[PDB]
């Protein structure tokens, strides 16, 4: 589909200098929204919707953490040169453009409706997300590391976190959900490196 | 062997109520010392020596202090706080003797690291008495099972094979990655977890 992309009215700091964008279809029979695919979820599970937005959008916003020092200082009043080297480094480590952050939000909502125990999504949400990522398959959502089926009750606050299959890549394809344990075990390795690692370790331990 | 164990002079908070003990062999000449097996290392690798002492004795508060109850903590040590700091301090509590044991084991491991300096005869003979012959480059990640190098100590962490067990048999070194990965699982549970993970991914 083609998206609205019209500027969404906001009282956000970012909104004073940059636009939040309409994510409704270009056609669009109402008021223009940033997170339409989350409306039902916000109605049924407020903290899950909010956690999806936060993990998709925040570190300050990831699409602010990508802006250069001059723009931070002048338009947001952030003197990066004041902060110690390490916090500048970590801030940059979390950077992602605006569209990517929204993409991630969409992916995570799509995964969430396929959790065991998930609410049933309305037809708009279902069709909109399915258009992006394919048919929803009930109960298919697993830990990206564990490969264990996740239940929505886990998201209750955590025990579940947002995962990046390959380190430092913030887009729809690369994200999912993971047990806290599995997510911290993976650390700075990609999935394939992590599995390869486990394989070598076990080989070694089975020797002697 | 038989150990000195006479009180060692300290300006420490613990020492006003409990002793620091000589760990030289009983009837030693010279002054009595708590960490004799570490003086040589402290000369060339003070950071490593310091890490060994911290990991063996500390939790902020010593492990052998944290094995004492709140009443003695307010009375003897004059210490009332959040719960996830309190029981978290309780978690890693161990007897003073076990702590020193851990320090011995860690030093014995350190002298067997690739690139390790060579121990002096006192240190070598003393530690080998407790743990057996040092063999060069034998020190491996407790988890990875790969050989460790001394330059990793600029990372490496002290590992516990079984959680909640601070003794010589149970401790070793581990790459930072391997050690955080293990989290709160024993070694066997961690390997078993890996096997389940690989089994599931090979099916997909």
């Amino acid at each position: 589909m083609e998206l609205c992309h019209k500027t969404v009215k906001s009282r956000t700091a970012y909104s004073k200098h940059f636009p939040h964008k309409c994510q409704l279809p270009l056609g669009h029979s109402g008021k223009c929204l940033e997170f339409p695919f989350l409306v039902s979820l916000s109605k049924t599970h407020p903290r899950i919707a909010a956690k999806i937005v936060r993990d998709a959008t925040m570190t300050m916003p990831r699409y602010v953490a990508i802006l250069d020092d001059d723009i931070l200082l002048e338009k947001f009043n952030l003197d990066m040169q004041s902060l110690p080297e390490i916090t500048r480094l970590k801030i940059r480590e979390k950077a992602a453009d605006y569209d990517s952050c929204i993409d991630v939000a969409r992916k995570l909502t799509w995964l969430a409706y396929q959790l065991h125990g998930a609410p049933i999504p309305d037809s708009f949400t279902k069709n909109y997300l399915e258009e992006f990522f394919g048919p929803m398959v009930a109960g298919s959502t697993n830990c990206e590391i564990c490969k264990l089926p996740l239940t929505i009750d886990l998201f209750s606050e955590a025990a579940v976190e947002t995962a990046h299959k390959t380190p430092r890549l913030h887009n729809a394809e690369n994200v999912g959900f993971a047990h806290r344990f599995c997510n911290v075990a993976q650390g700075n390795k990609s999935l394939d490196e992590f599995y390869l690692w486990m394989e070598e370790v076990l080989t070694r331990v089975k020797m002697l």
Side-chain angles (χ1 to χ4, degrees), chain A residues 1-15 17-74 76-156 158-208:
Chain A
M1 63 175 43
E2 215 80 81
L3 301 176
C4 189
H5 269 21
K6 289 205 283 189
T7 303
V8 171
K9 298 182 175 180
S10 250
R11 0 190 116 99
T12 263
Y14 183 78
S15 65
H17 313 273
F18 304 99
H20 298 260
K21 312 182 204 172
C22 192
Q23 304 287 332
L24 265 319
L26 190 55
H28 185 342
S29 173
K31 73 132 91 171
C32 245
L33 300 148
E34 193 183 23
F35 299 107
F37 54 99
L38 278 168
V39 171
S40 301
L41 198 60
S42 274
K43 188 221 306 145
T44 60
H45 297 78
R47 284 169 172 155
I48 295 180
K51 274 185 255 275
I52 285 165
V53 170
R54 176 252 274 155
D55 290 355
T57 285
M58 309 288 308
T59 296
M60 94 176 75
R62 294 168 162 265
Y63 49 76
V64 158
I66 205 176
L67 302 170
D68 75 68
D69 296 349
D70 313 314
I71 288 174
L72 292 183
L73 174 69
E74 195 244 2
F76 288 95
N77 284 313
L78 216 329
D79 173 23
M80 293 289 299
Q81 280 169 67
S82 83
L83 314 180
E85 169 126 318
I86 289 178
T87 93
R88 305 170 80 176
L89 257 41
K90 276 152 190 177
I91 285 166
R92 298 325 193 172
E93 227 179 277
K94 290 302 201 83
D97 64 273
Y98 176 90
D99 293 349
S100 297
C101 296
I102 311 306
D103 287 342
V104 162
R106 258 185 300 255
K107 175 63 180 302
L108 258 17
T109 311
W110 179 81
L111 259 3
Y113 278 112
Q114 292 174 91
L115 252 358
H116 187 267
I120 282 72
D122 58 288
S123 43
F124 162 73
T125 314
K126 176 163 190 294
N127 294 320
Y128 174 96
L129 294 170
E130 275 183 347
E131 166 123 349
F132 280 94
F133 308 116
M136 284 181 178
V137 179
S140 56
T141 292
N142 307 324
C143 182
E144 297 290 335
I145 301 107
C146 347
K147 309 309 185 197
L148 276 181
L150 302 177
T151 63
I152 192 160
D153 74 298
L154 291 184
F155 293 56
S156 114
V160 168
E161 299 181 331
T162 284
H164 296 79
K165 295 170 207 178
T166 281
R168 285 178 42 154
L169 207 88
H170 200 67
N171 58 43
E173 186 280 317
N174 196 47
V175 293
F177 298 127
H179 296 103
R180 163 94 190 157
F181 180 88
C182 306
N183 203 30
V184 338
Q186 185 203 348
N188 61 8
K189 297 191 184 294
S190 74
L191 243 40
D192 296 345
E193 288 153 13
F194 192 24
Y195 297 148
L196 175 68
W197 180 76
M198 299 180 189
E199 209 148 58
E200 295 159 346
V201 170
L202 289 163
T203 291
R204 261 178 235 122
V205 342
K206 288 165 158 153
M207 305 258 220
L208 272 116

